[PDB]
Design an enzyme around this catalytic site. Structure first.
Site, PDB file in Angstrom:
ATOM      1  N   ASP A  31       0.866  -1.202   0.136  1.00 38.81           N
ATOM      2  CA  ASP A  31      -0.083   0.126   0.037  1.00 38.81           C
ATOM      3  C   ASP A  31       0.788   1.191   0.117  1.00 38.81           C
ATOM      4  O   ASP A  31       0.208   2.299   0.324  1.00 38.81           O
ATOM      5  CB  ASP A  31      -1.054   0.328   1.170  1.00 38.81           C
ATOM      6  CG  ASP A  31      -0.282   0.253   2.530  1.00 38.81           C
ATOM      7  OD1 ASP A  31       0.793   0.127   2.749  1.00 38.81           O
ATOM      8  OD2 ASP A  31      -1.180   0.526   3.658  1.00 38.81           O
ATOM      9  N   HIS A  49      24.724   3.828 -17.106  1.00 35.86           N
ATOM     10  CA  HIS A  49      23.621   3.923 -16.163  1.00 35.86           C
ATOM     11  C   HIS A  49      23.930   3.033 -15.016  1.00 35.86           C
ATOM     12  O   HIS A  49      23.020   2.585 -14.298  1.00 35.86           O
ATOM     13  CB  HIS A  49      22.240   3.785 -16.795  1.00 35.86           C
ATOM     14  CG  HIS A  49      21.759   4.680 -17.852  1.00 35.86           C
ATOM     15  ND1 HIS A  49      20.880   4.624 -18.777  1.00 35.86           N
ATOM     16  CD2 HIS A  49      22.551   5.793 -18.753  1.00 35.86           C
ATOM     17  CE1 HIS A  49      20.803   5.361 -19.445  1.00 35.86           C
ATOM     18  NE2 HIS A  49      21.755   6.231 -19.656  1.00 35.86           N
ATOM     19  N   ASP A  63      27.355  10.988 -12.319  1.00 35.04           N
ATOM     20  CA  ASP A  63      26.264  11.501 -13.023  1.00 35.04           C
ATOM     21  C   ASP A  63      24.724  11.903 -12.174  1.00 35.04           C
ATOM     22  O   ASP A  63      24.221  10.862 -11.874  1.00 35.04           O
ATOM     23  CB  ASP A  63      25.869  10.643 -14.190  1.00 35.04           C
ATOM     24  CG  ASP A  63      25.138  11.036 -15.285  1.00 35.04           C
ATOM     25  OD1 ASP A  63      24.234  12.105 -15.036  1.00 35.04           O
ATOM     26  OD2 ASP A  63      25.300  10.726 -16.451  1.00 35.04           O
ATOM     27  N   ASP A  86      21.323  18.028 -15.341  1.00 36.33           N
ATOM     28  CA  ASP A  86      21.939  16.843 -15.753  1.00 36.33           C
ATOM     29  C   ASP A  86      23.823  17.470 -15.828  1.00 36.33           C
ATOM     30  O   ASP A  86      24.069  17.645 -16.926  1.00 36.33           O
ATOM     31  CB  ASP A  86      21.419  16.041 -16.891  1.00 36.33           C
ATOM     32  CG  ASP A  86      22.049  14.812 -17.099  1.00 36.33           C
ATOM     33  OD1 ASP A  86      22.924  14.342 -16.492  1.00 36.33           O
ATOM     34  OD2 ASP A  86      21.728  14.256 -18.345  1.00 36.33           O
ATOM     35  N   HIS A 143      27.613   6.029 -26.925  1.00 31.75           N
ATOM     36  CA  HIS A 143      26.367   6.874 -26.974  1.00 31.75           C
ATOM     37  C   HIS A 143      26.396   8.175 -27.518  1.00 31.75           C
ATOM     38  O   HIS A 143      27.704   8.304 -27.985  1.00 31.75           O
ATOM     39  CB  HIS A 143      26.111   6.896 -25.222  1.00 31.75           C
ATOM     40  CG  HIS A 143      27.055   7.734 -24.638  1.00 31.75           C
ATOM     41  ND1 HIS A 143      27.215   9.063 -24.417  1.00 31.75           N
ATOM     42  CD2 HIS A 143      28.125   6.995 -23.589  1.00 31.75           C
ATOM     43  CE1 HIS A 143      28.174   9.453 -23.716  1.00 31.75           C
ATOM     44  NE2 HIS A 143      28.692   8.217 -23.030  1.00 31.75           N
ATOM     45  N   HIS A 157      21.667  15.216 -25.714  1.00 31.48           N
ATOM     46  CA  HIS A 157      20.267  14.972 -25.588  1.00 31.48           C
ATOM     47  C   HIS A 157      19.632  16.206 -25.275  1.00 31.48           C
ATOM     48  O   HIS A 157      20.246  17.085 -24.579  1.00 31.48           O
ATOM     49  CB  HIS A 157      19.898  13.828 -24.833  1.00 31.48           C
ATOM     50  CG  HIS A 157      20.273  13.867 -23.260  1.00 31.48           C
ATOM     51  ND1 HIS A 157      19.729  14.619 -22.491  1.00 31.48           N
ATOM     52  CD2 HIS A 157      21.118  13.188 -22.699  1.00 31.48           C
ATOM     53  CE1 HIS A 157      20.050  14.384 -21.137  1.00 31.48           C
ATOM     54  NE2 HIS A 157      21.379  13.521 -21.371  1.00 31.48           N
ATOM     55  N   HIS A 182      16.005  13.287 -20.392  1.00 27.67           N
ATOM     56  CA  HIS A 182      16.084  13.007 -21.969  1.00 27.67           C
ATOM     57  C   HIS A 182      14.779  13.447 -22.614  1.00 27.67           C
ATOM     58  O   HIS A 182      13.734  13.133 -22.643  1.00 27.67           O
ATOM     59  CB  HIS A 182      16.058  11.588 -22.280  1.00 27.67           C
ATOM     60  CG  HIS A 182      17.341  10.753 -21.815  1.00 27.67           C
ATOM     61  ND1 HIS A 182      17.299   9.252 -21.648  1.00 27.67           N
ATOM     62  CD2 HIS A 182      18.506  11.242 -21.574  1.00 27.67           C
ATOM     63  CE1 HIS A 182      18.674   9.040 -21.266  1.00 27.67           C
ATOM     64  NE2 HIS A 182      19.208  10.307 -21.225  1.00 27.67           N
ATOM     65  N   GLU A 205      28.094  15.701 -23.515  1.00 25.69           N
ATOM     66  CA  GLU A 205      28.263  14.397 -22.573  1.00 25.69           C
ATOM     67  C   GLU A 205      29.555  13.539 -23.311  1.00 25.69           C
ATOM     68  O   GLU A 205      29.135  12.585 -23.359  1.00 25.69           O
ATOM     69  CB  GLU A 205      27.450  13.877 -21.807  1.00 25.69           C
ATOM     70  CG  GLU A 205      26.340  13.368 -22.639  1.00 25.69           C
ATOM     71  CD  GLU A 205      25.109  12.954 -21.838  1.00 25.69           C
ATOM     72  OE1 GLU A 205      25.359  12.369 -20.784  1.00 25.69           O
ATOM     73  OE2 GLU A 205      24.054  13.131 -22.306  1.00 25.69           O
ATOM     74  N   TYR A 232      35.145   4.720 -22.437  1.00 27.44           N
ATOM     75  CA  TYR A 232      35.065   3.786 -21.378  1.00 27.44           C
ATOM     76  C   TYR A 232      35.750   2.698 -21.842  1.00 27.44           C
ATOM     77  O   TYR A 232      35.313   1.916 -22.843  1.00 27.44           O
ATOM     78  CB  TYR A 232      33.379   3.425 -21.165  1.00 27.44           C
ATOM     79  CG  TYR A 232      32.495   4.812 -20.973  1.00 27.44           C
ATOM     80  CD1 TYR A 232      32.264   5.326 -22.430  1.00 27.44           C
ATOM     81  CD2 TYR A 232      32.587   5.435 -20.015  1.00 27.44           C
ATOM     82  CE1 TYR A 232      31.498   6.393 -22.147  1.00 27.44           C
ATOM     83  CE2 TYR A 232      31.559   6.393 -19.932  1.00 27.44           C
ATOM     84  CZ  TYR A 232      31.197   7.011 -21.233  1.00 27.44           C
ATOM     85  OH  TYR A 232      30.343   8.259 -21.020  1.00 27.44           O
ATOM     86  N   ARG A 240      33.378  10.494 -17.912  1.00 28.81           N
ATOM     87  CA  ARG A 240      32.278  11.271 -18.770  1.00 28.81           C
ATOM     88  C   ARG A 240      32.346  12.400 -17.831  1.00 28.81           C
ATOM     89  O   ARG A 240      32.529  12.647 -16.721  1.00 28.81           O
ATOM     90  CB  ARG A 240      31.255  10.667 -18.579  1.00 28.81           C
ATOM     91  CG  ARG A 240      29.870  11.425 -19.234  1.00 28.81           C
ATOM     92  CD  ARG A 240      28.746  10.702 -19.744  1.00 28.81           C
ATOM     93  NE  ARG A 240      27.873  10.067 -18.522  1.00 28.81           N
ATOM     94  CZ  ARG A 240      27.641   8.857 -18.278  1.00 28.81           C
ATOM     95  NH1 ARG A 240      28.599   7.704 -18.652  1.00 28.81           N
ATOM     96  NH2 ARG A 240      27.368   8.297 -16.898  1.00 28.81           N
ATOM     97  N   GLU A 298      30.007  16.152 -18.341  1.00 23.67           N
ATOM     98  CA  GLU A 298      28.962  16.907 -18.896  1.00 23.67           C
ATOM     99  C   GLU A 298      28.406  18.023 -18.407  1.00 23.67           C
ATOM    100  O   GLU A 298      28.416  18.236 -17.094  1.00 23.67           O
ATOM    101  CB  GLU A 298      27.663  15.748 -18.721  1.00 23.67           C
ATOM    102  CG  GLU A 298      26.507  16.269 -19.115  1.00 23.67           C
ATOM    103  CD  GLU A 298      25.344  15.249 -18.842  1.00 23.67           C
ATOM    104  OE1 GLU A 298      25.450  14.582 -17.636  1.00 23.67           O
ATOM    105  OE2 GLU A 298      24.333  15.349 -19.446  1.00 23.67           O
TER     106      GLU A 298
END
Ligand SMILES: [Mg+2]
Ligand SMILES: [Mg+2]
Ligand SMILES: [Mg+2]
Ligand SMILES: [Mg+2]
Lengths: 440, 440, 440, 440
Positions: D38, D243, D260, D271, D350, D354, D361, D383, D387, D404, D406
């Site tokens: 619940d 991610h 990130d 972001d 990638h 974006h 996104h 970004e 890797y 990374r 960004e």
């Protein structure tokens, strides 16, 4: 013949007998079914719902509640009476008349089912429900159980156990009572009369559908309004299509015609197949195939009795078939090897027998490969056939011949009773019948 | 009569004409429909799908793609050929034969529709789809559009505009071509012949369903296998039930019988109603009601023409009805006041006319209260009736009388053509027909 | 503290113990859940699936199959390993590593569940399934059972009995093992530390959400990343809203603030409520209400033990409340009459105690009005409160006061253990804690 | 910063401007979403519904009705006020307060939507609806349209045209107004402050989740309660998972950590990604990879302006990357050939950029391969990352490095504005920041 009020009552009690205490069984009516736009097909009740009620309305639910071994009661949900709806679509039983008419303890309005059903299931341990049978039923039942599940604070509890009643109920339907057998006996007569008439009316140049018309009319005149399945009239090469229903072809002198048709009388199905010459005289090639199929049927009728099985009798039919086909040079080689290779399968590609009752292909467990031991009160078809494709690599004269001959039987204490032998199947008797008719 | 390949082609082009450029229209086949267990009702194709194809299989989809004003092409999805399925359930068109047979550019397997449909809709601006018509169709179309929506990275784009084609297509179906009128003309003849036969066969002591049997047989013998709707044979008080289909009662000397029956011939519906005495002789009381209904019909046939409406002709019928009922003392008071009070409604509670075509209650916009101005090529029924309830507070002799008389017409340039006047409706002609038959 | 591999194994065996022979239990993982567009909320496994696995992936199904009393085996369906998906969304257990890692006999790919599940259920008598829990689960299970039902000819049979395992499994979850109690003990400490910190950080002019920030940070630093429920920080009149989560208001000198917050540590919930003055000093009016709530809690902690119930202890709380409110002139009249009239309900409108475990409102049967006799290993909250509406017709000084004080306990052999008493609740101790923090 | 009442009004009018006359647009609220049993996750309104309303309740629907080019009106459906529900779950706007509060003409109860919506759509030509967005919405809309379709006799007509408003609305969201840019500017600052704090707090031996705790707290203290997406703290080899959200590992001296994280402030997403040494000092090998990524970002920030595209700038990044990797001997061969072979893809898999807004996104058409020409008011991320897999066949020192960096930008008339440059990214500045913090 008909099914009595007392019989519907016995069936209900026989189901309740097998139910756990603290349980309810839910049996839903068939929905109405669109044919096109706002027109619907003639209504056909769910066979299992009908079995326990003889009630021919939609939007109805039988609820049988077993409190314990000596206490049980019934609730019907059904359509409320409505003057406007009844001016248009005819009379409704309603709630007041239902207890007496259908022998139930209580009748409530179907429009209140969602407000009432969860109250009937509250505190029970088991619910018998045929899950997946109808989507509208599943919605109603799941909705009821969710209310109970989520209603802890209102002191509601759902039954945790759901059991499918179809196995139990179909096992009951597998064994016909004397009343049911009497009704099926009459369905067999009515269907036989239709088949005799089609043989007597057949002339070259008539269409396949004309014999369908003759058959349906004869059903109707004995009070069986609808067929139990879509009528098959396959002349010539169409006889090689097992469920041919187009019935669109002109029937030609020289061809055979295979008629597979059955009436529905008080819910119960007849199912007869007769194959005969369109011109009233079998050719040599036609007789050669017909005789193998006829021997198969006649031998099967001799053999069917308690203690054997559809599988065991099928083995005898296969032997008869393979032997006959070898003699005609349709098969080549050793009979026993050809049997072990299932060499008959290009020509006989279906089962010899299916259960018969409220459904033409009736409910009830067959066992693996239809090995179930037969007992008195089982009702079944006996329908050997041979179908030689137009393009089969066999002597030319046999190509495009489809022959099936089917009778309906009930297993008795010492053998079987044939319900459909009032229409002829011996070829000389077929030919005499058609000659006599042609004079007328 | 029949519908040509060229006509199906014209219809498709007429739809494409009205479509936006950069669009596709999706027209789905009717699903097969269970009657009980593994038996299905005779297949009836979706009327709109049939309209554009004359193709009588399920699992089929017509896709018409308009690139621009001079460029369009068609794809059919349909069932693949399958030797095993065709040995059982009969022949299938398949993909190879479909382009030539049905005049489409391309035919693909229905089993590949989910792999192929989104590719056909990719990059289009508009999709015409009858949303909610069939659940299986909606699943397929929504699934296609979601792939396109979510496929930005694969350079896919969904059409953002969905339009219902039913309004456009039903507006086309509202106006019959000369071919369609010729087919409906034959359906009217076939149906008329069935109604004549029922009058000639009727005797006291026969059941209502026996006349149904006679009607269905006569449909069948002229190549109309199925009725367009469930046959109504309401004798006595059953004539007061508008869609009475039980047909279960013994027909009694002294009663009227109302027969509402129509064949389906090449997809198109006949729809005739005749009411007549079971014993071949109208009583005074029966004539008194019959004459009001007959005058209503005859006046309506005089009046129907381009430039009037169902509403306008209905007003004349109401006047005739109210005046007649006042003279019999069934209504009391001033005619014009009783008209303004709709005092006829207890006795005439339905519309005078509905559209007729591929559906008995055909598609096409009626306007408010059926006020739409009639034009040449519209096809409709004319079916006044009077139904006096068993319990109506009226003189005893009129209670339990239900009378309806219905003809089918096409609106012409200067009036109408009656498609169903080959079966008699003047009472002296009914009585002469039955006397002649009784000799036988 | 943590839950061992052996414990997950014991739980599975404890369930299997209670299952019928010839049965399988199906326990499905929670689906992933969209927050907005392509972003999902942090994954939270189904509590019951977690209970038996400690496995934190979606698209997984535990199948426990009991052959008989000494023979059972387990199958896991789970996500296959995928290099591309794992470069993006992190590592997956896969099938090879799963048997050893999770102590199951067999692991198959979730993408093959529809090809494999019906084979696992074939020939069984019973299936345990939590019907309606998840739609994706129901689709998979119904689909499996329909294959079996319809596969008579392929010698397949469906289990006819479906049982809900939630009652059984929730009854197991109701009684915590020593490992579970150790984990809940740590969750109680972590949550207590968060509540102490919020009291120490509170200043007039900070927003309600700032204390939420402090609480969530302290959860996080002890390895409880997520709260067990959405944090409640209701200052002033917001304290009268039971599940106030907006936490949007500036906290004002003079007001109380009610903090209801709990961490989730190894799946298990803490749940503490403390109410305190924003300025570190209770007013007379605030003390007058606080003392009634504190006495209620302290008395409840004295009373809770095996052999009593939430209902029985609630009756003592109601007496304390009604007596206190009468002395303040918030209620007027005879205490025993006011009790019989439930006159406390405008001010105390929720239950004193709920079960606590893997869910903050934990599973397990309460009995009518929470009358179930308490036994060792039950874990519950004790959370009396008084909430005087801004518009209550009571002396002005009490209006808009909401106070709740909550501890978490485990029932022991002789009483209870308090899991949350490491954060202060006596008002003098609250005030000393805040004074000390304000120096520092 | 915030979004004004007038701005929500402008957006609504801007949508109405583009709608056809005789149309209505239906925008539905997000459903509440279960976390477990619940308990529900914190509510997140549908981004598009929020865009036009700033209303944060579920069970609400905005209906914008355009009569013609100068006439339009709005109806809101929303939850009715309920004293009991509001004592528990907090205050509701209700119908009386909604017109003034949200600037709509009319507000009706959501519980009456099925009784009212079809009346609003009656007689319209077009309905704008985001089909498939929410199942509860589709049910409501389909239900409304079916009533209209089937209500010919009640003079009801459905709009035949349904248009998806998402393309139009997302095209609006693609271009930020000055108010939106001011809000995103603040989200960028808040997010930057969180990232600075994480760098300052990082020590060897802390867990990845501890930095998540620091980040979420800093969001909260500036009034951004929730993150815009699940926070990524990937130290060591976890930095190679794009991610990575487990954040479960101890951070080790010698490793890099990639953070990130983005706040959600007044609906809008920040972001930022920063990668830095856990011990405050980049190794040679780490600097060698970091410098390639930093140059990529810095060059991209130079280049982004009206008239270029994400695709065009990505080509420059690829060149920088391939050249850098060749110098380190991670790639071997000719730069231009390696570029043509997409040899960077094992290390940069990638997109560079974006769209950013109400969703991290964000909505809006990219064009093929993100080739869309950039214009002022577009907001996007920059970004670049490299890797190198733990098992890559490259010099040992580069294996298991994920970096990374960004920033978030808005396209201006002459270039771009960087919203996130208040947190450092030059390595010497990172190291100075951490040294300073470690003193303290
Ligand atoms: Mg031949
Ligand atoms: Mg009479
Ligand atoms: Mg006060
Ligand atoms: Mg290394």
């Amino acid at each position: 013949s008909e099914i009595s009020r007392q019989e519907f009552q016995r069936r209900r009690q026989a189901l309740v007998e097998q139910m756990q205490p603290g349980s309810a069984a839910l049996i839903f009516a068939a929905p109405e079914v669109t044919r096109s736009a706002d027109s619907e097909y003639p209504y056909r009740q769910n066979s299992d719902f009908w079995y326990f009620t003889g009630f021919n309305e939609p939007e109805a639910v039988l609820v049988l509640i077993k409190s314990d071994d000596t206490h049980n009661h019934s609730v019907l949900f059904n359509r409320v009476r409505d003057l406007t709806a009844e001016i248009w679509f005819g009379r409704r039983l309603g709630q007041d008349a239902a207890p007496e008419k259908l022998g139930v303890d209580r009748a409530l309005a179907f429009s209140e089912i969602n407000q009432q059903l969860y109250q009937l299931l509250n505190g029970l341990d088991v619910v018998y429900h045929a899950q997946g049978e109808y989507a509208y039923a599943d919605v109603i039942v799941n909705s009821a159980l969710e209310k109970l599940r989520k209603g802890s604070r209102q002191n509601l509890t759902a039954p945790a156990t759901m059991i499918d009643w179809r196995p139990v109920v179909h096992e009951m339907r597998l064994f016909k009572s004397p009343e049911e057998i009497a009704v099926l006996r009459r369905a067999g007569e009515i269907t036989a009369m239709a088949h005799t008439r089609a043989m007597e009316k057949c002339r070259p140049g008539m269409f396949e559908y004309h014999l369908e018309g003759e058959i349906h009319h004869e059903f109707n005149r004995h009070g069986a309004r609808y067929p139990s399945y879509n009528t098959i009239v396959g002349s010539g090469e169409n006889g090689c299509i097992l469920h041919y229903t187009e019935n669109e072809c002109e029937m030609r002198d020289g061809d055979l015609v295979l008629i597979d048709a059955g009436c529905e009388y008080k819910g119960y199905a007849g199912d007869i197949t007769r194959t005969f010459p369109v011109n009233g005289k079998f050719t040599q090639a036609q007789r050669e195939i017909y005789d193998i199929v006829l021997e198969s049927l006649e031998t099967s009728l001799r053999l069917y009795r308690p203690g054997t099985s559809i599988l065991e009798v099928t083995g005898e039919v296969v032997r008869i078939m393979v032997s006959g086909l070898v003699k005609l040079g349709i098969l080549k080689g050793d009979v026993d090897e050809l049997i072990a290779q299932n060499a008959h399968r290009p020509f006989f590609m279906h089962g010899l027998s299916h259960w018969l009752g409220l459904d033409v292909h009736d409910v009830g467990v067959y066992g693996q490969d239809r090995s179930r031991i037969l007992e008195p009160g089982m009702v079944l078809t006996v329908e050997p056939g041979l179908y030689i494709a137009p393009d089969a690599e066999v002597p030319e004269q046999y190509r495009g011949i489809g022959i099936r001959i089917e009778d309906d039987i009930v297993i008795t204490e010492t053998g079987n009773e044939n319900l459909t032998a009032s229409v002829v199947k011996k070829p000389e008797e077929i030919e005499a019948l058609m000659v006599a008719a042609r004079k007328q």
